[PDB]
Design a protein around this ligand. Structure first.
Ligand SMILES: NC(=O)C1=CN([C@@H]2O[C@H](COP(=O)(O)OP(=O)(O)OC[C@H]3O[C@@H](n4cnc5c(N)ncnc54)[C@H](OP(=O)(O)O)[C@@H]3O)[C@@H](O)[C@H]2O)C=CC1
Ligand SMILES: NC(=O)C1=CN([C@@H]2O[C@H](COP(=O)(O)OP(=O)(O)OC[C@H]3O[C@@H](n4cnc5c(N)ncnc54)[C@H](OP(=O)(O)O)[C@@H]3O)[C@@H](O)[C@H]2O)C=CC1
Ligand SMILES: NC(=O)C1=CN([C@@H]2O[C@H](COP(=O)(O)OP(=O)(O)OC[C@H]3O[C@@H](n4cnc5c(N)ncnc54)[C@H](OP(=O)(O)O)[C@@H]3O)[C@@H](O)[C@H]2O)C=CC1
Ligand SMILES: NC(=O)C1=CN([C@@H]2O[C@H](COP(=O)(O)OP(=O)(O)OC[C@H]3O[C@@H](n4cnc5c(N)ncnc54)[C@H](OP(=O)(O)O)[C@@H]3O)[C@@H](O)[C@H]2O)C=CC1
Ligand SMILES: COc1cc(Cc2cnc(N)nc2N)cc(OC)c1OC
Ligand SMILES: COc1cc(Cc2cnc(N)nc2N)cc(OC)c1OC
Lengths: 266, 254, 256, 266
């Protein structure tokens, strides 16, 4: 029974990914930060379909120390991987999906929305993924060859549109650039242990409708294929395929799931 | 029952792709140039597992006239037509056929045939085939159209790090990548997806020890399986992108 | 010592600004043209007036077709272009593949399909290939002691081809081939110290669309592009090779 | 008389860049961290060539708070660097993010180390550049249009080889990917103020030889053009050109100065 750890698994794409892996027979460690209710509701459904196929772990992946001596981001990340080994004795798949997304304009007490944004955006999107990968790799390396899984796979959720940045989202964009970098570096270094590291880059998926309907139809109509944002499955299915043994030769690459959005120009 | 046209389907990757699509329920038009025996043997196997699930069509995809003189465009249209004539539809196109040999820049008509052969098979033919494919979908009344039109271009994961002496081939692959993006954008309104699959080193005829993952060339399946997935309805949101199937080779340096 | 530059499609717009730019650096210039005979000759006169014997003009169709005398092939025509530089000045230091046909070839909605393909693919890709091969043979054939010290080939590419212009498939394909040529030629010709780079304009000297460019909200001047070509040719850029420089004012960073 | 701020200007490429800009008529603020002697020696030479054409500011660009005389954050330290240009000369026209730590952070084959490394590598190569750009931009924005310079230019020192990562240098590679991201995001957002943001990516320049001669030669004989590492001028001259008014249409692009190294494969 293979195990998958999905960060930010409570809802939207993270939920669809977790559900997708679960349908392939995976036991799933659903990580969450604030969405406790939703995470627990998802665990219940999965555990109902298949007894002992889901657990829930809470963690702030922001680059800050947590409350008692203080706990570092690294420790918190190691604990996430450990929870998989403690409960099921293994961890075969890692999906770095958790991600903060809000503006940090280069143009205009207060240093709160200053230092906290950097650590939140950079930690969730890049530093935490880094530590999680190290921890994941360490556990594989420590396992005697005779007891290793046969299909280790790490998926990093990136962004198909960062080459054409969203105005005002500099740190987020910077953070995603770092994640792409991690994908290539990790793929190369972990190749001898047969651990594949790839990336999935959504364009517009399950677009949040907290705006005037027309403005919302304005965004989705810019996508050349279907003139709409994608469903969560349209993205999660790709993540699932990259984790399958049929994709065992793919590593170090980023797959755009954007319906041709990146091919547009103003 | 959906139809797939695979150029250069007789052996190696082309064969594995055809076999892969066939296992998903597709009727397959196996294209070939010189490999007549191999192509016919493959059709027999597929037709034996499922009656009327395979045919074979011969064509030179080089940018020249043949058999008054028949142009490359006509030959390409005939390939697509053969699918409509036999089965009444064509849902998938896989531009896999490709010549691959050196054209050194440093030491007559031997290059004249090389240019048209390498550029035709790898880029010009694919262009005409897509055009023919798109014309046929457009001409079909909306109510009768298939629900999963997909075109796959076989590109190269290593062309950003060129193989010494293979300029025309490398140029041709660059054109094919360009075709993938342009076609994806123009055919989007008809729900025709256009993507690319880029192998690194697959089923070699030394250097394979330098592939970071497994330290070997890939099997044909390790590549064909990706082409199959991109054709599945699960991948319906993917278009205009190239997927590397190279085991991390493109991440290396000298 | 006066170095020589061959600039294809040098009669007007960017090609002319490139030729003028190289000429102001002391280069003797071979202005190639196809149909623009009058402009090419007027440009030669100006350059030859400023500096005697610093310009010549040569005519050639760079389309992938055979012309009548055994028909003259595109390769031969390209070799002749490079030869004209050696015949007149005894050297060829810089090659700028600038000539380019640009019109739609829609996928949706006969003689023109065959002539469009060879015209767009030849001018934008096959001619540049043959020209580079011819340029390289001549350098290779020249005894080491006699070789120039700054061999540079510039390919005019396109900053926006990753975000294709709707309906321009063959042109877009041709530019992709040219980028491929830039990398392949840079690698193979490195032992001979011949550098091969690319310059990719976005919107330059156009004949509401330009208001979409992030920088200045306008199309560029010819100089704003040619000056980059000139710098990449300078000895100060002797370590750059196999790279494409976008000169687009951030246009490629936009999205619909 | 235009002003240029060059971080990590004390030696090698940073020096060559400062010297390059100085020869074009620029007044130069030379930043340094631990190379005080070399920085002061460089200031002396430049000031001897042209009185009052050079100053020096010390700063740790690592993502950590320092000890004042309430700690001082990285952001404040960055604002102070830009401020020093305005205080001394009343202007700042060019910013060159050159300062950079570069050492291994392995994923495998293995505390205080895995803490300070992250902030040092990520701060110097990405977080500091972000804050510096932000500070530079408010400064231009706060200047009345009539008093603005006519050629604002920011150059970020990136890496031509990060798409083919150096084994074991994950954080560094991740940091460079963030920097590329910053170059595109800033270019787009600062375009209305006519501030250009570009990248220059060296391959092998002035290679360190703390290794056997053969190993050093090996690395050098892999560069296709000349079979050698570049001189500092071969790189700095490109930075200087991108800053010239002749390059006023270039923005958001990265220029490789690698002699074809990125075109190679194993
Ligand atoms: N959807 C889209 O249009 C696009 C998505 N992507 C990428 O795809 C992935 C998934 O997309 P989507 O579903 O929209 O993502 P969401 O924006 O919904 O965020 C996913 C989860 O990340 C968690 N999270 C946020 N910050 C932190 C943090 N500080 N520490 C720990 N967890 C945190 C949250 O969990 P919780 O609720 O428990 O707090 C949140 O539900 C993301 O990585 C995103 O970057 C990229 C481009 C476009
Ligand atoms: N295998 C690899 O390591 C790599 C492969 N690729 C790409 O993957 C694809 C498949 O790879 P692979 O199986 O090795 O390909 P092959 O080299 O075996 O060629 C495929 C087929 O193309 C057909 N073909 C060649 N020239 C022509 C022509 N002038 N007109 C019509 N058909 C022609 C041949 O068919 P016939 O026998 O009937 O004449 C041949 O069997 C190719 O497109 C290739 O470019 C890219 C990088 C690496
Ligand atoms: N300007 C722009 O906005 C952009 C330009 N570019 C590229 O920059 C380069 C220069 O741009 P621009 O000045 O606008 O180019 P032009 O469109 O003005 O064309 C340049 C010249 O190419 C020559 N030419 C065209 N077809 C042929 C052919 N069949 N055989 C021989 N010569 C031919 C013509 O010469 P003649 O008059 O003598 O017949 C023409 O004057 C081109 O390569 C273009 O692709 C790329 C993106 C944008
Ligand atoms: N040289 C090469 O082969 C390559 C260089 N590059 C990039 O080019 C740029 C310049 O190259 P190079 O001259 O080799 O750079 P160096 O390795 O010599 O470093 C440049 C300077 O950065 C400063 N620095 C390092 N860490 C910090 C920090 N924590 N806070 C403040 N300053 C710091 C140091 O200044 P001080 O001495 O005062 O402490 C150092 O002298 C760099 O950004 C590098 O990443 C990229 C690829 C290859
Ligand atoms: C194209 O414009 C927008 C696109 C998106 C999509 C998006 C992009 N990235 C991430 N991480 N999440 C998203 N929802 C989100 C937006 O903001 C809600 C946009 O408007 C500024
Ligand atoms: C290819 O291997 C190496 C390459 C480099 C180049 C290099 C790469 N990045 C930076 N910032 N500086 C450099 N000198 C530097 C090295 O030294 C640590 C290498 O290891 C021997």
């Amino acid at each position: 029974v293979p195990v998958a750890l999905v960060t930010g698994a409570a809802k939207r794409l993270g939920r669809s990914i977790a559900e997708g892996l679960h349908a392939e027979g995976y036991a799933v460690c659903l990580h969450y930060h604030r969405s406790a209710a939703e995470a627990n509701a998802l665990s219940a459904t999965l555990n109902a379909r298949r007894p002992n196929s889901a657990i829930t772990v809470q963690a702030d992946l922001s680059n800050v120390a947590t409350a008692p001596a203080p706990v570092t981001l690294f420790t918190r990340c190691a604990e996430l991987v450990a929870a998989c080994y403690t409960h099921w004795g293994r961890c075969d798949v890692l999906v770095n999906n958790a991600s903060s997304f809000y503006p940090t304009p280069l143009l205009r007490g207060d240093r709160e929305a200053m230092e906290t944004a950097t650590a939140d955006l950079f930690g969730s999107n890049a530093i935490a993924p880094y530590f999680l990968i190290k921890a994941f790799a360490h556990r594989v390396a420590g396992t005697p060859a005779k007891h290793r899984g046969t299909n280790y796979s790490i998926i990093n959720m990136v962004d198909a549109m960062t080459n054409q940045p969203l105005l005002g989202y500099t740190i987020y964009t910077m953070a995603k650039g770092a994640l792409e970098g991690l994908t290539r570096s990790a793929a190369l270094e972990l190749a001898p242990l047969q651990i594949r590291v790839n990336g999935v880059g959504p364009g517009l998926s399950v677009l949040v409708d907290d705006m005037p309907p027309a403005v919302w139809e304005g965004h989705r109509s810019k996508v050349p294929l279907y003139q709409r944002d994608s469903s969560a499955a349209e993205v999660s299915d790709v993540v699932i395929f990259l984790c399958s043994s049929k994709a065992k030769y793919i590593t170090g690459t980023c797959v755009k799931v954007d319906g041709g959005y990146s091919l547009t120009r103003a």
